[PDB]
Design a protein around this ligand. Structure first.
Ligand code: PLP
Ligand code: PLP
Ligand code: 4AT
Ligand code: 4AT
Lengths: 302, 302
């Protein structure tokens, strides 16, 4: 079995200290336990695997893959690219941590820095150009149906099976929209009354009607509605503030022994609120995108 | 399920690019995918669990626990102490990464930095001094049989089960000696011809007859023979040099998508030497204690 085969089958834990007596049960799936350290392993592998299936990519060819990403997707892709013999090129703002660059380079990925002023736009522009020049494959994580497909085929099934189908609400901090759509559809088909609740930064509450803005929940709250996010699935949206979430992430590490990432703090915080709403005899499920290792420099853990 | 319950059940992959055609199959169990990020999660839980079983510790008591460690053991214990409500104190050289201190403190552990020049010697003395003035419990990872029992009860079964009981040689870079002993006994009770081969830094070849010395394989090579190490299980000892292991560690990440730790580089290297001696058809299994994440600022990945 290759590294990709080790993707998924992550455990789920039930919170026992940060919950309150009248709360519904709260379960968290630890995606930080994937080979690449995050939930992106799934989408990364599926977008490339799908590309192979369609005859766009040929394994061990050295073919070029390019994607504009400054987060876990770049890591997921670098890991997969390294395994299947692909030449990966990632575009990103120069403000990128002199820490995150090292891991990406460790997998042999090529990093192309872009105007820190233009940001996401410049990164995408450069990636598109490279796509054209090198005739490379571009995942395009926000529009790629294979992103959703990964969670519809693995993440969803895993969560449903591990929780014996006893799920009243599913909570997630949407980023590319793939996880909530993927898991969302899967659970809906079998638990039609299940409530799918999205979570977004209060400071960039585009799903609530608000407007884009800076926020510290790395990995989620893109500042717009991506093509991969199916709104029809949502039964509500919870806005989370760094002021409440970070302290909670600290309680999680300290009291539950769960050292999770920034997006996790907001997501679990949301799950907790949904848990108060539903009450005893109900089970709320959510997902921890990644661990707290890559955020030791943020005020969340400094 | 609590965090401690999400420990283990780690995947095992087969190398496909770094091996040669005249080599036996080479399988690697990824212990970096445990909640605490390393193989230590197991002995950490077992030593604590054993203490609770014997009535030395009651969960949520806030009872003080002390242990000298500048590696993964401190992290696993930190996670467990946080999960079960215990007050952990760790002693270690003052050098210590600042991020490494941040992760331990994220779990609420307390740190005591000792004399850098005298390495673990100073930490050990400072930990004993604390056990004496506070009446604290001390895991004592090098002498505690629970360390061993953890691998004899989970790691071993997992590996045997995952490889269809087909294992010709098991290779491992002994640290506390718990893993090679625990897994070793397990395998040698079910596979009459299985060869258990220990691995140690050439620069601290205590098992080979040489004397202890400074080396870069963090996590293994204590520079002495620990109680937990059952020498009667060994069928050989391979010495490894960083000049060999590190380049390979780099190759594993770039060619197999396996971003592993320093000790993993030396262990895998030794595994290939065995894989070649045994020849094709045969199966060699070894274990990757942890991932590359914590070593991005070391000459291994910087
Ligand atoms: C990808 C990611 C998310 C969001 O999941 P999507 O499937 O992209 O909606 C949240 N947090 C982190 C840290 C992520 O990497
Ligand atoms: C603990 C450890 C080892 C050695 O395993 P033992 O079970 O202690 O023999 C090797 N490498 C790393 C990184 C470790 O943390
Ligand atoms: C909503 C996001 O910012 C997603 C980032 C996804 C990534 O590139 O890891
Ligand atoms: C033999 C060792 O160096 C062991 C290190 C185990 C520890 O992380 O404390």
């Amino acid at each position: 079995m290759r590294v990709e085969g080790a993707i998924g089958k992550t455990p789920v834990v039930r919170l026992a200290k940060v919950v309150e007596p009248d709360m519904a049960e709260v379960w968290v799936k630890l995606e930080g336990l994937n080979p690449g350290g995050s939930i992106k392993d799934r989408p990364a592998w599926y977008m490339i695997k799908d590309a192979e299936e369609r005859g766009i990519l040929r394994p061990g060819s050295g073919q070029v893959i390019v994607e504009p990403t400054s987060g876990n997707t770049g890591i997921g892709l670098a890991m997969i690219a390294a395994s299947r013999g692909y030449r990966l090129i990632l575009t990103m703002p120069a403000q990128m941590s002199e820490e995150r660059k090292r891991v990406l380079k460790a997998f042999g990925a090529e990093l192309v820095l872009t105007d820190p002023e233009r940001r996401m736009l410049a990164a995408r522009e450069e990636a598109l150009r490279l796509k054209e020049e090198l005739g490379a494959f571009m995942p395009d994580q926000f529009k790629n149906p294979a992103n959703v497909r990964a969670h519809y085929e693995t993440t969803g099934p895993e969560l449903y099976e591990a929780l014996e189908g006893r799920i009243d609400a599913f909570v997630y901090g949407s980023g590319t929209g793939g996880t909530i759509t993927g898991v969302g559809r899967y659970l809906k088909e079998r638990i039609p009354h299940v409530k799918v609740i999205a979570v977004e930064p209060a400071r960039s509450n585009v799903l609530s009607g608000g407007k884009m803005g800076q926020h510290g929940f790395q990995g989620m709250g893109p500042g717009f509605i991506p093509e991969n996010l199916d709104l029809s699935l949502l039964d509500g949206v919870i806005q989370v503030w760094e002021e409440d979430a970070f302290p909670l992430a600290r309680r999680l590490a300290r009291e539950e022994g769960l050292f999770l990432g920034m997006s996790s703090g907001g997501i679990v915080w949301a799950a907790l609120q949904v848990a108060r709403e539903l009450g005893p005899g109900k089970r709320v499920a959510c997902i921890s995108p990644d661990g707290g290792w890559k955020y030791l420099s943020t005020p969340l853990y400094a």
